[PDB]
Coordinates of N, CA and C in Angstrom, one line a residue:
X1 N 0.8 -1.2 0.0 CA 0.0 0.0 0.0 C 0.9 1.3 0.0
X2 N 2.1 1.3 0.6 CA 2.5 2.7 1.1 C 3.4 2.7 0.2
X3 N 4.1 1.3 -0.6 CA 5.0 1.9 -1.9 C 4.0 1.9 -2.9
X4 N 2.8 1.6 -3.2 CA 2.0 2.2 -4.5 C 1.9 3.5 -4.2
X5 N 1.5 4.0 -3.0 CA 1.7 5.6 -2.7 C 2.9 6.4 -3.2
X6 N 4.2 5.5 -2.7 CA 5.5 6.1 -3.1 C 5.8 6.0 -4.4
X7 N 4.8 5.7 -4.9 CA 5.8 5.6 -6.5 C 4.9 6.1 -7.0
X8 N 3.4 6.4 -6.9 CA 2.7 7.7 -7.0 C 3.3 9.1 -6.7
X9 N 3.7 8.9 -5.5 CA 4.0 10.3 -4.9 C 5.7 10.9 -5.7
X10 N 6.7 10.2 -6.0 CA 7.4 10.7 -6.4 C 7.2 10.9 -7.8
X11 N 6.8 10.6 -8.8 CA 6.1 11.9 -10.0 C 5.6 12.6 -9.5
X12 N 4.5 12.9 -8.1 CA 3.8 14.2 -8.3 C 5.0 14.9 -7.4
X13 N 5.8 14.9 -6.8 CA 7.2 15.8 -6.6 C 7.8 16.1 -7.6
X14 N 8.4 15.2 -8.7 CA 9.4 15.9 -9.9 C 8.1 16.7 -10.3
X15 N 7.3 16.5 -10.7 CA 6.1 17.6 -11.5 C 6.3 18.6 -10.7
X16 N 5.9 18.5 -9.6 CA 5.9 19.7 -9.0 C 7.0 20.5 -9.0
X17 N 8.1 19.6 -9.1 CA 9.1 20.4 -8.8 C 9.5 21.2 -10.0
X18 N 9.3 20.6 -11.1 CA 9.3 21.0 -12.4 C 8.4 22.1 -12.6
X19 N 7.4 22.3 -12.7 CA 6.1 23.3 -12.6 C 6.6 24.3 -11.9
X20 N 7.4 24.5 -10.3 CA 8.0 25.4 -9.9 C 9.0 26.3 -10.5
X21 N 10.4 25.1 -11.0 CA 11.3 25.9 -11.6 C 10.9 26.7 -12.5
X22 N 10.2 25.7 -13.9 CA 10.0 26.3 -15.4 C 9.1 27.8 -14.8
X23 N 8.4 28.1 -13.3 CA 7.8 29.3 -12.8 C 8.9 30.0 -12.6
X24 N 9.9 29.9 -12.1 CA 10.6 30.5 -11.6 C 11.7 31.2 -12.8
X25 N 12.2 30.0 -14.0 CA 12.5 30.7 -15.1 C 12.0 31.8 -15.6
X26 N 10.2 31.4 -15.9 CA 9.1 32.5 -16.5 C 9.7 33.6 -15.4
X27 N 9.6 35.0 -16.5 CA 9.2 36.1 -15.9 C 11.1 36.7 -15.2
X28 N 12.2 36.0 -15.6 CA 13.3 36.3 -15.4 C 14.1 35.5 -14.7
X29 N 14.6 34.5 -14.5 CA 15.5 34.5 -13.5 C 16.4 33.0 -14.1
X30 N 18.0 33.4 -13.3 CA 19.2 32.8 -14.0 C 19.0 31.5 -13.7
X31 N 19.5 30.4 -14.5 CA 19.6 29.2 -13.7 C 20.3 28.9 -12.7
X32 N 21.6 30.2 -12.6 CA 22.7 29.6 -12.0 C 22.1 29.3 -10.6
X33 N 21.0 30.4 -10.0 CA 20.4 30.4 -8.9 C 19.3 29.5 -8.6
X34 N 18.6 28.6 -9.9 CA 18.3 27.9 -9.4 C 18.5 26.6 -9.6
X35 N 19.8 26.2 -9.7 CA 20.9 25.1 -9.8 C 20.9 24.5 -8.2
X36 N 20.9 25.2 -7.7 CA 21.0 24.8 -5.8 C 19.3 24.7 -5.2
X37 N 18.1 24.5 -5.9 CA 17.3 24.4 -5.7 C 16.3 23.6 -5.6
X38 N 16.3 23.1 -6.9 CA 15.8 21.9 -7.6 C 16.2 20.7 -8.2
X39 N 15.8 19.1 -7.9 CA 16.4 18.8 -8.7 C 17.1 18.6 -9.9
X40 N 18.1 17.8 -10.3 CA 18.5 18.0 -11.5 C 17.9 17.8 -12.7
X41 N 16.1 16.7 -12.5 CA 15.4 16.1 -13.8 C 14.4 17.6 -14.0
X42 N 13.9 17.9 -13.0 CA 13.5 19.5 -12.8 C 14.0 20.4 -13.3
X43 N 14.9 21.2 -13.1 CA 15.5 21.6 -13.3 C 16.0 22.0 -14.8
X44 N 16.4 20.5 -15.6 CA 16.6 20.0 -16.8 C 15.5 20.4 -17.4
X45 N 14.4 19.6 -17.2 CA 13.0 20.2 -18.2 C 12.8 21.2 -18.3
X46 N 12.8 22.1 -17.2 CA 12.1 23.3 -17.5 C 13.4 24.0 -18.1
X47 N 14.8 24.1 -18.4 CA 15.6 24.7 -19.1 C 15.2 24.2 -20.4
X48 N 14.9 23.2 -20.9 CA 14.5 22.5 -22.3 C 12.9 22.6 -22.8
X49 N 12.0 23.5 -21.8 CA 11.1 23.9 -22.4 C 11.4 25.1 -22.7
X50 N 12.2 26.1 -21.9 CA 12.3 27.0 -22.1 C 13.1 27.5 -23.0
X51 N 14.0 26.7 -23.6 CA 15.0 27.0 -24.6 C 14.1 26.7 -25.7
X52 N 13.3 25.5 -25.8 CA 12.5 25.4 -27.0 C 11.7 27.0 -27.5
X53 N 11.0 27.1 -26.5 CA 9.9 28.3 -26.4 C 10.9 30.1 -27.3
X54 N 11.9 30.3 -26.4 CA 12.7 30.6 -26.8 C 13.2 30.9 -28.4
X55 N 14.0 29.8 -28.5 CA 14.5 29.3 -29.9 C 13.3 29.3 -31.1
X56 N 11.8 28.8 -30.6 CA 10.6 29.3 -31.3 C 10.6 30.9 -31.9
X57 N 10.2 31.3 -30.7 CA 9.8 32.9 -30.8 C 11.3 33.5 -31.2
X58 N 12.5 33.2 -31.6 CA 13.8 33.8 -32.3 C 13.4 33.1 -33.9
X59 N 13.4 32.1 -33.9 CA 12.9 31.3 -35.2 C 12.3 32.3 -35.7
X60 N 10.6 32.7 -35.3 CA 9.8 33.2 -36.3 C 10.3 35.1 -36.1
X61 N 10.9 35.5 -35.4 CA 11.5 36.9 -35.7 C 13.2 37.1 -36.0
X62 N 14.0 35.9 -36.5 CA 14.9 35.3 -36.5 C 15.9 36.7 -36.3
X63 N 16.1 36.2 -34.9 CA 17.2 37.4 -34.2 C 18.0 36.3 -33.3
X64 N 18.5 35.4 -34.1 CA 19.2 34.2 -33.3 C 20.6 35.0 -32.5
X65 N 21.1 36.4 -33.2 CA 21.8 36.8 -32.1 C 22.4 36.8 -31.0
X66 N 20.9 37.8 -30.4 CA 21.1 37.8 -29.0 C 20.6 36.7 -28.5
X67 N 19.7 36.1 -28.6 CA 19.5 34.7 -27.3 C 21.1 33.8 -27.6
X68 N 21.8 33.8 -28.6 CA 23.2 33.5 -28.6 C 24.1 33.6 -27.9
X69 N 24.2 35.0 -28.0 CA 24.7 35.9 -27.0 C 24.5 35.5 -25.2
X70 N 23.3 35.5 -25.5 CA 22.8 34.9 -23.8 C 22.9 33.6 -23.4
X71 N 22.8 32.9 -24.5 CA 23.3 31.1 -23.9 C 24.9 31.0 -23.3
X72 N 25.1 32.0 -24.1 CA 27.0 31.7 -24.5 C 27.2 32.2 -23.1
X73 N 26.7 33.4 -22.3 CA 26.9 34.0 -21.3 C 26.2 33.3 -20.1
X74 N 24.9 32.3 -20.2 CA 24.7 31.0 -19.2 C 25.7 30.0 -19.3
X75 N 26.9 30.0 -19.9 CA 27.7 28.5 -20.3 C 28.5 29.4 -19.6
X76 N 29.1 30.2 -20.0 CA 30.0 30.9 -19.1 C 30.0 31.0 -17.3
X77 N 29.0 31.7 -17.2 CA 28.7 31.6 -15.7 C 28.3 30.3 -15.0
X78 N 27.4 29.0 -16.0 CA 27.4 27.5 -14.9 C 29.2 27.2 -15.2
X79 N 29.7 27.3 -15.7 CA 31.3 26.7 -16.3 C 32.2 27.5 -14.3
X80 N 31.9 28.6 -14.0 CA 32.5 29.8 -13.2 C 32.0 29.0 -12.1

């Protein structure tokens, strides 16, 4: 009974935890800070939704530039 719970319960943790980060990305903020937060499958997703979403909205006004610019300066700072 209590591991059909636990093996329930730990997807609705990574979700959740996931659902928080990809919030915490929305609306500004570095990963570097929330590297010490979340786990790393969390974490992971919501950078890779958000780079999709991203790389979308550059696609159709193709200003691959600057979000260039800005990856290159997140590789820099997790690398630091």
């Amino acid at each position: 009974e209590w591991l059909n719970i636990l093996d329930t319960e730990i997807k609705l943790s990574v979700f959740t935890q996931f659902r928080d980060c990809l919030g915490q990305l929305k609306d500004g903020t570095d990963i570097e800070v929330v590297v010490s937060k979340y786990i790393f499958q969390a974490i992971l997703l919501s950078a890779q939704v958000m780079w999709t979403e991203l790389v979308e909205k550059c696609l159709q006004t193709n200003q691959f530039s600057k979000y260039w610019k800005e990856v290159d300066m997140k590789i820099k700072g997790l690398l630091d």
